[PDB]
Amino acid sequence: SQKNGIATLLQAEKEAHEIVSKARKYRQDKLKQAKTDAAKEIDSYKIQKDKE
Amino acid sequence: MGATKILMDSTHFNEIRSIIRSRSVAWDALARSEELSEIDASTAKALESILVKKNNGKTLIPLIHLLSTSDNEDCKKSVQNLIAELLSSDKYGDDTVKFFQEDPKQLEQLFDVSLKGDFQTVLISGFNVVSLLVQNGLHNVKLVEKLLKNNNLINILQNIEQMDTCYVCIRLLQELAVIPEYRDVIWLHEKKFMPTLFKILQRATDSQLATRIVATNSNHLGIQLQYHSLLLIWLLTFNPVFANELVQKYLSDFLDLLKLVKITIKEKVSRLCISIILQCCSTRVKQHKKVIKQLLLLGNALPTVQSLSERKYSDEELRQDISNLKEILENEYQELTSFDEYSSELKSGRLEWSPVHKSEKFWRENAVRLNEKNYELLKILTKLLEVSDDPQVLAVAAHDVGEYVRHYPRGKRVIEQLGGKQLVMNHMHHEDQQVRYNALLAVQKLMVHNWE
Amino acid sequence: ELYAIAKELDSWFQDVTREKAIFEILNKSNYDTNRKILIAEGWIPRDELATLQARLGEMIARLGIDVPSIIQVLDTNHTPPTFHRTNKFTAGFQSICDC
Amino acid sequence: LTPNQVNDELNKMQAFIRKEAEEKAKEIQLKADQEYEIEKTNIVRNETNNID
Structure with missing residues (x-):
């Protein structure tokens, strides 16, 4: 209907906005994860080279 | 089970399922009538008897090997797909992953009892198994070697007058493509299928599917085949060097793709056209400028560039897409x-x-x-x-x-x-x-x- | 070149005028940026409503994707106008009457 | 027809739009993953140059 149709449209709208925002937050988290993983792996690799 | 769930919105998969699945027929009398060891048929029958929601799941494991070297194509397809879904239904055996895991021998053996028979048989035997090689975590790298050097399925895909076949084949291909390290291996076989990937779009080029003067161009949702195709072409968007060369061979069709941005009313379609052509651009690889040079040489898109520019579509992803597109294509234009x-x-x-x-x-x-x-x-x-x-x-x-x-x-x-x-x-x-x-x-x- | 082109420069004039007009038809319409199905309404007669609520498909038979149309039944406060007919033969009479 | 048909059309189109937003967000998150990987790559490459 419409008395609840408008509410359903609002819920679909907030669903879309929330999912895209969560995706962008995951994007920034991917950037920070790149930083952290680079740090971890390169520390391990430095240990590797020094032991070698 | 967070594994693959495929094409739920579709119906051709559903018809080729229900053609033999909806049959609530005797699955026990087969072996008793000189088809197999009898307990195997007893449990094939018990499949549906135990199908009632029981909130077990550990009394059907050994049956995988039994249907291996069968000699009467009557008693695998159906229960095969039934157990396949039972797995897919995330209610039975949600931890079947480990049993699948410790040794896939019971799985990789399935090749000779999978993707066989007629095209319909090939599908009904292959979809189930490939749904299970989606085992979360790593996936078998070896079965694919035999699944690709084969040729019967490819012969099934060679036809042009049938759309369900290639549709579903490459659709599951892209679903599994989630493992980025498989587009690589299949690359060498590019010339076998990529032209097939391109023929549909070349038809779409001047064929105005949207204008329904084309009687039964595709099922009401069939056009989504193009959507899936471009989905795959995007799935190869994290290795530029892959895109680097094959272009020299079929640059022309890639070029005249340009029309799809304006032609298709569907946002998805123009979107994927533009995104793919752009993302071909990258600072990652070499000669990443001459391509746009030839673009201007033959197509002269800049008219089209600003034309589509004036008519944005309220899509942020697309906003950035086109913004990049314009700047990246225009800044060099004055390289004179x-x-x-x-x-x-x-x-x-x-x-x-x-x-x-x-x-x-x-x-x-x-x-x-x-x-x-x-x-x-x-x-x-x-x-x-x-x-x-x-x-x-x-x-x-x-x-x-x-x-x-x-x-x-x-x-x-x-x-x-x-x-x-x-x-x-x-x-x-x-x-x-x-x-x-x-x-x-x-x-x-x-x-x-x-x-x- | 003029001889050749005018023949259909006229046609382009007609076409652009029509495309214009359909813009303006859209331009007294609604638009929102984030939601993707518009809010709309119609002012066609209940008298001929059946044929057009059928031709929804015929129109969509020329573009069918997912929606024959969307039309939800609800009537708010308003004064419907009045309509009259002449059958192209009593034109003078009813024309003078209305004017 | 009936208001049920149009209501179902509204809801199915909403579901389709939500799927579109989900899949596009997935494309962007995967792009985040690629930027992740390449950034980590160049960082580790400079680190490897120095270490070598």
């Missing part, structure tokens, strides 16, 4: 301090209608280049013009002479050194009315602004 390339052309002896040939945005003042040798740099072009009558070069040679004299009104003396007006009127007396038009333009503008 063309003394070097004009000299290269001069020594090349070949001329052609080109923005490199024609761009006044610099010629506002460039007679400095003309000043290298008594303005004779173009006199060589003039004498070649006299030598032959090749339309492109013949026209372009005198095309910009009018512009160049427009750049210096003082150049009347070099003009009279030219004194080609008789040649110009002759060009108004040769074929290809367009070049006659250009020659008239040159002579008229020249004389007029010598005596404006």
Whole structure:
């Protein structure tokens, strides 16, 4: 209907906005994860080279 | 089980399922009638008997091997797909992953009892197994080797008049493509399928599927086949070097893809067109500029660029897509301090209608280049013009002479050194009315602004 | 060139005028940026409503994707106008009457 | 027809739009993953140059 149709449209709208925002937050988290993983792996690799 | 869930919105998969699944027929009398060991059929029957929601799941494991070397295609497909879904239904055996895991021998053995029989048989035997090679975490890298060097399924995909087949085959192909390290291996087999990937879009090019004058072009949701195809073409968007070469072979169809941005009303379709063509661009790989050069050479998209620019579609992803697109394609467009390339052309002896040939945005003042040798740099072009009558070069040679004299009104003396007006009127007396038009333009503008 | 082109420059004039008009039809319409199905309404007669609520499909038979249309039944406060007929033969009479 | 048909059309189109937003967000998150990987790559490459 419409008395609840408008509410359903609002819920679909907030669903879309929330999912895209969560995706962008995951994007920034991917950037920070790149930083952290680079740090971890390169520390391990430095240990590797020094032991070698 | 967070594994693959495929094509739920579709129905052709559902029809090729229900054709043998909805049959609530006896699955026990088979072995008793000289088909198999009898307990196997008893449990094939118990499949549906235990199908009632029971909130077990550990009394059907061994049956995988049993249907391996069967010799009567009557008692695997159905229960095969039934157990496949039972797995898919995330309610039975949600931890079947480990049993699948410790040794996939019971799985990789399935090849010879999978993707066999007729195309419908190939599907009904292959979809189930491939749904299970989606085992979260790593996935078998070895079965794919045999699944690809094979040729019967590919023969199934070779047909053009059937769409369900290629649709579903490459659809599951892209679903599994979630493992980025498989597009690589299949690359060498590119020439076998990528042309197939391109034929559908080439048909879509001038075929106006949206205009329903095309009776039954695809099922009401069938057009989504193109959507899935471009989905796959995007799934290969994290290895540029892969895109680097195959272009040299089929650049033309990739180019004329340009139309899809404006043609399709569907946002998805134009979106994927533009996104794919762009993401081909990357600082990652080499020669990542000449591609757009040839783009301008043949297509001349900039009209289309701004045309689509004026009509955005309220999609942020698309906003950034097109913004990049425009800037990346336009900033180089002024890569023309063309003394070097004009000299290269001069020594090349070949001329052609080109923005490199024609761009006044610099010629506002460039007679400095003309000043290298008594303005004779173009006199060589003039004498070649006299030598032959090749339309492109013949026209372009005198095309910009009018512009160049427009750049210096003082150049009347070099003009009279030219004194080609008789040649110009002759060009108004040769074929290809367009070049006659250009020659008239040159002579008229020249004389007029010598005596404006 | 003029001889050749005018023949259909006229046609382009007609076409651009029509495309214009359909813009303006859209331009007294609604638009929102984030939601993707518009809010709309119609002012066609209940008298001929059946044929057009059928031709929803015929129109969508020329573009069918997912929606024959969307039309939800609800009537708010308003004064419907009045309509009259002449059958192209009593034109003078009813024309003078209305004017 | 009936208001049920149009209501179902509204809801199915909403579901389709939500799927579109989900899949596009997934494309962007995967792009985040690629930027992740390449950034980590160049960082580790400079680190490897120095270490070598």
